[PDB]
Design a protein around this motif. Sequence first.
Motif, PDB file in Angstrom:
ATOM      1  N   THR A  88     -29.943 -24.379 -15.860  1.00  0.00           N
ATOM      2  CA  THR A  88     -28.786 -24.066 -16.689  1.00  0.00           C
ATOM      3  C   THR A  88     -27.535 -24.656 -16.055  1.00  0.00           C
ATOM      4  O   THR A  88     -27.094 -24.206 -15.000  1.00  0.00           O
ATOM      5  N   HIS A  89     -26.969 -25.668 -16.704  1.00  0.00           N
ATOM      6  CA  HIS A  89     -25.853 -26.417 -16.139  1.00  0.00           C
ATOM      7  C   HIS A  89     -24.530 -25.674 -16.297  1.00  0.00           C
ATOM      8  O   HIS A  89     -24.173 -25.249 -17.395  1.00  0.00           O
ATOM      9  N   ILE A  90     -23.812 -25.533 -15.186  1.00  0.00           N
ATOM     10  CA  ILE A  90     -22.588 -24.736 -15.122  1.00  0.00           C
ATOM     11  C   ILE A  90     -21.486 -25.241 -16.053  1.00  0.00           C
ATOM     12  O   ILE A  90     -20.759 -24.445 -16.646  1.00  0.00           O
ATOM     13  N   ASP A  91     -21.372 -26.557 -16.197  1.00  0.00           N
ATOM     14  CA  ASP A  91     -20.282 -27.133 -16.978  1.00  0.00           C
ATOM     15  C   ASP A  91     -20.362 -26.769 -18.459  1.00  0.00           C
ATOM     16  O   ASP A  91     -19.340 -26.704 -19.143  1.00  0.00           O
ATOM     17  N   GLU A  92     -21.572 -26.529 -18.950  1.00  0.00           N
ATOM     18  CA  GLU A  92     -21.763 -26.225 -20.363  1.00  0.00           C
ATOM     19  C   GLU A  92     -22.569 -24.947 -20.586  1.00  0.00           C
ATOM     20  O   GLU A  92     -22.104 -24.022 -21.252  1.00  0.00           O
ATOM     21  N   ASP A  93     -23.773 -24.901 -20.028  1.00  0.00           N
ATOM     22  CA  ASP A  93     -24.670 -23.769 -20.238  1.00  0.00           C
ATOM     23  C   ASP A  93     -24.224 -22.530 -19.468  1.00  0.00           C
ATOM     24  O   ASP A  93     -23.499 -22.625 -18.476  1.00  0.00           O
ATOM     25  N   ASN A  94     -24.665 -21.367 -19.934  1.00  0.00           N
ATOM     26  CA  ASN A  94     -24.348 -20.106 -19.279  1.00  0.00           C
ATOM     27  C   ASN A  94     -25.096 -19.967 -17.959  1.00  0.00           C
ATOM     28  O   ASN A  94     -26.205 -20.477 -17.813  1.00  0.00           O
ATOM     29  N   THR A  95     -24.485 -19.275 -17.003  1.00  0.00           N
ATOM     30  CA  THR A  95     -25.072 -19.121 -15.676  1.00  0.00           C
ATOM     31  C   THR A  95     -24.852 -17.716 -15.119  1.00  0.00           C
ATOM     32  O   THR A  95     -23.749 -17.175 -15.189  1.00  0.00           O
ATOM     33  N   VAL A  96     -25.911 -17.128 -14.569  1.00  0.00           N
ATOM     34  CA  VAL A  96     -25.844 -15.790 -13.991  1.00  0.00           C
ATOM     35  C   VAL A  96     -26.363 -15.797 -12.555  1.00  0.00           C
ATOM     36  O   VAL A  96     -27.339 -16.479 -12.246  1.00  0.00           O
ATOM     37  N   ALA A  97     -25.705 -15.042 -11.679  1.00  0.00           N
ATOM     38  CA  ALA A  97     -26.130 -14.940 -10.287  1.00  0.00           C
ATOM     39  C   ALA A  97     -26.089 -13.495  -9.793  1.00  0.00           C
ATOM     40  O   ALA A  97     -25.180 -12.738 -10.136  1.00  0.00           O
ATOM     41  N   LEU A  98     -27.082 -13.116  -8.996  1.00  0.00           N
ATOM     42  CA  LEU A  98     -27.105 -11.797  -8.374  1.00  0.00           C
ATOM     43  C   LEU A  98     -26.953 -11.934  -6.869  1.00  0.00           C
ATOM     44  O   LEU A  98     -27.820 -12.485  -6.192  1.00  0.00           O
ATOM     45  N   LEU A  99     -25.840 -11.431  -6.353  1.00  0.00           N
ATOM     46  CA  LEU A  99     -25.527 -11.530  -4.935  1.00  0.00           C
ATOM     47  C   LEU A  99     -26.161 -10.374  -4.171  1.00  0.00           C
ATOM     48  O   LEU A  99     -26.394  -9.311  -4.744  1.00  0.00           O
ATOM     49  N   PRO A 100     -26.447 -10.576  -2.872  1.00  0.00           N
ATOM     50  CA  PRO A 100     -26.918  -9.471  -2.025  1.00  0.00           C
ATOM     51  C   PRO A 100     -25.893  -8.344  -1.916  1.00  0.00           C
ATOM     52  O   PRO A 100     -26.230  -7.249  -1.471  1.00  0.00           O
ATOM     53  N   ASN A 101     -24.653  -8.624  -2.310  1.00  0.00           N
ATOM     54  CA  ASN A 101     -23.632  -7.593  -2.447  1.00  0.00           C
ATOM     55  C   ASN A 101     -24.076  -6.504  -3.414  1.00  0.00           C
ATOM     56  O   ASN A 101     -23.767  -5.327  -3.234  1.00  0.00           O
ATOM     57  N   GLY A 102     -24.818  -6.914  -4.437  1.00  0.00           N
ATOM     58  CA  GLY A 102     -25.168  -6.045  -5.542  1.00  0.00           C
ATOM     59  C   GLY A 102     -24.352  -6.458  -6.747  1.00  0.00           C
ATOM     60  O   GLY A 102     -24.509  -5.924  -7.842  1.00  0.00           O
ATOM     61  N   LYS A 103     -23.471  -7.429  -6.530  1.00  0.00           N
ATOM     62  CA  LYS A 103     -22.585  -7.920  -7.575  1.00  0.00           C
ATOM     63  C   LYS A 103     -23.303  -8.886  -8.511  1.00  0.00           C
ATOM     64  O   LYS A 103     -23.889  -9.876  -8.071  1.00  0.00           O
ATOM     65  N   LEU A 104     -23.256  -8.586  -9.804  1.00  0.00           N
ATOM     66  CA  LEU A 104     -23.821  -9.466 -10.818  1.00  0.00           C
ATOM     67  C   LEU A 104     -22.718 -10.332 -11.416  1.00  0.00           C
ATOM     68  O   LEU A 104     -21.853  -9.839 -12.138  1.00  0.00           O
ATOM     69  N   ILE A 105     -22.751 -11.624 -11.109  1.00  0.00           N
ATOM     70  CA  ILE A 105     -21.708 -12.543 -11.552  1.00  0.00           C
ATOM     71  C   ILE A 105     -22.236 -13.545 -12.573  1.00  0.00           C
ATOM     72  O   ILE A 105     -23.122 -14.342 -12.270  1.00  0.00           O
ATOM     73  N   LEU A 106     -21.683 -13.503 -13.781  1.00  0.00           N
ATOM     74  CA  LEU A 106     -22.120 -14.394 -14.850  1.00  0.00           C
ATOM     75  C   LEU A 106     -20.997 -15.316 -15.320  1.00  0.00           C
ATOM     76  O   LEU A 106     -19.893 -14.867 -15.636  1.00  0.00           O
ATOM     77  N   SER A 107     -21.295 -16.612 -15.351  1.00  0.00           N
ATOM     78  CA  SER A 107     -20.347 -17.620 -15.806  1.00  0.00           C
ATOM     79  C   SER A 107     -20.678 -18.044 -17.232  1.00  0.00           C
ATOM     80  O   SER A 107     -21.690 -18.704 -17.473  1.00  0.00           O
ATOM     81  N   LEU A 108     -19.824 -17.665 -18.176  1.00  0.00           N
ATOM     82  CA  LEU A 108     -20.107 -17.879 -19.591  1.00  0.00           C
ATOM     83  C   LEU A 108     -19.107 -18.816 -20.261  1.00  0.00           C
ATOM     84  O   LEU A 108     -17.979 -18.978 -19.795  1.00  0.00           O
ATOM     85  N   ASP A 109     -19.528 -19.428 -21.364  1.00  0.00           N
ATOM     86  CA  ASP A 109     -18.630 -20.250 -22.166  1.00  0.00           C
ATOM     87  C   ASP A 109     -17.759 -19.354 -23.043  1.00  0.00           C
ATOM     88  O   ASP A 109     -17.966 -18.141 -23.099  1.00  0.00           O
ATOM     89  N   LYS A 110     -16.789 -19.956 -23.723  1.00  0.00           N
ATOM     90  CA  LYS A 110     -15.823 -19.197 -24.510  1.00  0.00           C
ATOM     91  C   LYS A 110     -16.483 -18.400 -25.632  1.00  0.00           C
ATOM     92  O   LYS A 110     -16.119 -17.253 -25.880  1.00  0.00           O
ATOM     93  N   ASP A 111     -17.454 -19.011 -26.304  1.00  0.00           N
ATOM     94  CA  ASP A 111     -18.155 -18.344 -27.397  1.00  0.00           C
ATOM     95  C   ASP A 111     -18.920 -17.115 -26.916  1.00  0.00           C
ATOM     96  O   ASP A 111     -18.809 -16.037 -27.499  1.00  0.00           O
ATOM     97  N   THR A 112     -19.690 -17.285 -25.847  1.00  0.00           N
ATOM     98  CA  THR A 112     -20.531 -16.213 -25.327  1.00  0.00           C
ATOM     99  C   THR A 112     -19.705 -15.074 -24.734  1.00  0.00           C
ATOM    100  O   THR A 112     -20.030 -13.901 -24.918  1.00  0.00           O
ATOM    101  N   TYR A 113     -18.636 -15.429 -24.027  1.00  0.00           N
ATOM    102  CA  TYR A 113     -17.781 -14.444 -23.372  1.00  0.00           C
ATOM    103  C   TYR A 113     -17.163 -13.473 -24.373  1.00  0.00           C
ATOM    104  O   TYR A 113     -17.046 -12.278 -24.102  1.00  0.00           O
ATOM    105  N   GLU A 114     -16.771 -13.997 -25.530  1.00  0.00           N
ATOM    106  CA  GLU A 114     -16.196 -13.171 -26.583  1.00  0.00           C
ATOM    107  C   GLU A 114     -17.248 -12.250 -27.183  1.00  0.00           C
ATOM    108  O   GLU A 114     -16.955 -11.114 -27.551  1.00  0.00           O
ATOM    109  N   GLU A 115     -18.476 -12.747 -27.273  1.00  0.00           N
ATOM    110  CA  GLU A 115     -19.560 -12.001 -27.901  1.00  0.00           C
ATOM    111  C   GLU A 115     -20.065 -10.858 -27.028  1.00  0.00           C
ATOM    112  O   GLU A 115     -20.551  -9.849 -27.536  1.00  0.00           O
ATOM    113  N   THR A 116     -19.954 -11.018 -25.714  1.00  0.00           N
ATOM    114  CA  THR A 116     -20.399  -9.981 -24.792  1.00  0.00           C
ATOM    115  C   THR A 116     -19.451  -8.785 -24.814  1.00  0.00           C
ATOM    116  O   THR A 116     -19.880  -7.636 -24.701  1.00  0.00           O
TER     117      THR A 116
END
Length: 345
Positions: A88-116
Motif C-alpha cells: 500500500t503506497h503512502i503517496d496515494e493508498d491508505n496506510t496503517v501502522a501499529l507501534l509497540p507504543n500501542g499507538k495505532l497510526i493510520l495515514s489516509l487520503d482526503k476521501d477516506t479521512y472524511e468517511e471515517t
Amino acid sequence: RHLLVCEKSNFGNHKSRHRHLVQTHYYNYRVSFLIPECGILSEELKNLVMNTGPYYFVKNLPLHELITPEFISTFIKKGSCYALTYNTHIDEDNTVALLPNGKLILSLDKDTYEETGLQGHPSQFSGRKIMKFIVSIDLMELSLNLDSKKYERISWSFKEKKPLKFDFLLAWHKTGSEESTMMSYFSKYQIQEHQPKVALSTLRDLQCPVLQSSELEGTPEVSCRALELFDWLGAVFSNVDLNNEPNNFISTYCCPEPSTVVAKAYLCTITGFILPEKICLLLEHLCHYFDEPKLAPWVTLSVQGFADSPVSWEKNEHGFRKGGEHLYNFVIFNNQDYWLQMAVG
C-alpha cells in the motif's frame, strides 16, 4: 541515497544511543552486514541470523480487530507488538501502522479521512491542497477507559461507519509469562507464518576502503572518508542484491583509495519483516566480533526500512521527523568505536 547524519562514537560510551536508535526504528525490511577477510561464519552468529523471525501475514484484516479489549490485553500489554500494511503506497493508498507504543497510526487520503469521521491532522500537502491525513489512536490510554465516549466513537468508526481492511505484516516480541500465539488468534483469517530470507554471499578478491576510526573525513592518502564508504557500501549491495538479467551482471562501481584487497569477503542479507529486538541482538554480536583478534579492519551493519510507513509529527534525536523509509549504517571498528550513518531517498 544522500547522507543526513554521520557521527562517531563508541559502544562502551554512556552517551551512545545505538540501542535507542535501533529500537525506535520499528519497521525494518532489509538487514545486511559485511565482513572483510572472513571465510566461514561462526555457529553462534549463524543461529542468530537464521532466527530473526518469525513474522506473519494476514489478508484483508479489518481495523476493528486491532482495537478490541482481547487484542489489547493479549498482545499489546504483554509485549512489543508491530504491524504495517502491505503493498500500500503512502503517496496515494491508505496506510496503517501499529507501534509497540500501542499507538495505532493510520495515514489516509482526503476521501477516506472524511468517511471515517475521526479527528486527525493534515499530513502531506500538494501545495495548497491536502493529500494525506494522519489519525493517531493510543490503545494503551483507551484501554484504561474502554467505556468512554472516545472508544465507542472510534469503535463505531471501525465497525459500522467505515469498515476498513488491509493486508497486514505482523510480528510480536514476547515478554509474556502467559502464552497465546498469533497464529491461533487470527485463525479465522488465513494467517501465514513466515521466516525472513537469509542470503549468504561470498565475494572473492574484493577491494575495500581503508578507514581511520577517529577520522570521519579521513586523512588524505592515508584513509578514506565516511562519505566515500557510504557510497561504496551502497554500490556493493546494489550489485549483489539486484541479481540482474544476463545483460547487467557486470559490476561498474569503483572502490575509494587508499584501499586494500581482501581474499574472502562475507556478505549476508536478511529480508522480510525484521524486529528491532533481533537487530539489537545482531548488532551486539557484531560489536563483540572483535573480542578475539581478527583479520578484519572493520565490519558493517546496514538496515533499510519500509518506504510506505506513516510519518509522525514527533522528531527524533537527530532533528527530523520519525517514520518513512529509514536507512542507517553501523561501521564497527575493533576498539568498539563506530560510525553512525543515516540517509533518505
